[PDB]
Amino acid sequence: PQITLWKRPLVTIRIGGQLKEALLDTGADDTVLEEMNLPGKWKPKMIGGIGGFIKVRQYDQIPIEICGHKAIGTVLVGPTPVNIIGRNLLTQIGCTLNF
Amino acid sequence: PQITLWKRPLVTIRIGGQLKEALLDTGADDTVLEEMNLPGKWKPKMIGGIGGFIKVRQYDQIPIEICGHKAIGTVLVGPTPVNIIGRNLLTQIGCTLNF
Ligand SMILES: CC(C)CN(C[C@@H](O)[C@H](Cc1ccccc1)NC(=O)[C@@H]1CN(c2ccccc2C(F)(F)F)C(=O)O1)S(=O)(=O)c1ccc2ncsc2c1
Questions:
Q1: Which residues lie within the region annotated Dimerization of protease (chains A, B)?
Q2: Residue B29 and residue A8: Cβ atoms within 8 Å?
């Protein structure tokens, strides 16, 4: 697909039994999802953006489906106001910026 | 150009005769630059990111050349962690997401 940027690039993602709307975000190194209780090991981390930092839980090798494209990798979970698909997963689904 | 996402999509911009590195940020509605001097009236604004809210100065109708593509639009100036080029100017240069 081609997604223009007139509006926020929100797409449907699936993580296990949860479907959520998330930004395809080229300005995000990492994938940051709003609070959810995923299974398995994790590690605490702090990530910074506009306004300062938030504490997140880093889960590794989590499969996520993005517009029917399979991805698997690190997902950060924390008190973000929006779900953010970062470059770690954007590359896996073949996402580029073009102009 | 086509830009892949294994590295941060950092590009050189020209603004007020100055060259700066800025991040092409599809997860950003607006363009937000680190502290700098721009001429003309500005208005105080507050914006919220992942870590909370900050105060910025809003300048309207500012020319920026992004990889040689001309834009003229609103630039917010304040304590962003990184210079970010948001959708207001990404649209002007014809930028889309493709996968
Ligand atoms: C700042 C940038 C270098 C990094 N961020 C990614 C951005 O795309 C971020 C993603 C993002 C989007 C929305 C909320 C929070 C975070 N966008 C924004 O902060 C700004 C806020 N804003 C926004 C939002 C609502 C109203 C007005 C604005 C305004 F437009 F502001 F008026 C908006 O439209 O973009 S991030 O979310 O902090 C981030 C993500 C992953 C990540 N991984 C490691 S550090 C790290 C940091």
A1: 1-5, 49-55, 88-99
A2: yes
Closest CA to B89 of B21, B11, B26, B16: B26
Strands (E), chain A: 2-3, 10-15, 18-24, 31-34, 43-49, 52-66, 69-78, 84-85, 96-98
Distance (Å, whole) CA B41 – CA B81: 24
Q: Is the dihedral of CA A7, A8, A11, A17 positive or negative?
A: negative
Which architecture, in CATH terms, is A1-99?
A: Beta Barrel (2.40)
Tell me which residue has tokens 């100017």. Answer: B89
Cα pseudo-dihedral B28, A56, B52, A28, rounded to 10 = -20
Tell me which residue has its CA closest to atom 46 in ligand 1. A28
> Which residues touch B14 (CB under 8 Å, ≥6 apart)?
B64, B65
Contacts of B42 (CB under 8 A, 6+ apart): B57, B58, B59, B77
Q: How far does CA B40 lie from the centroid of its chain?
A: 18
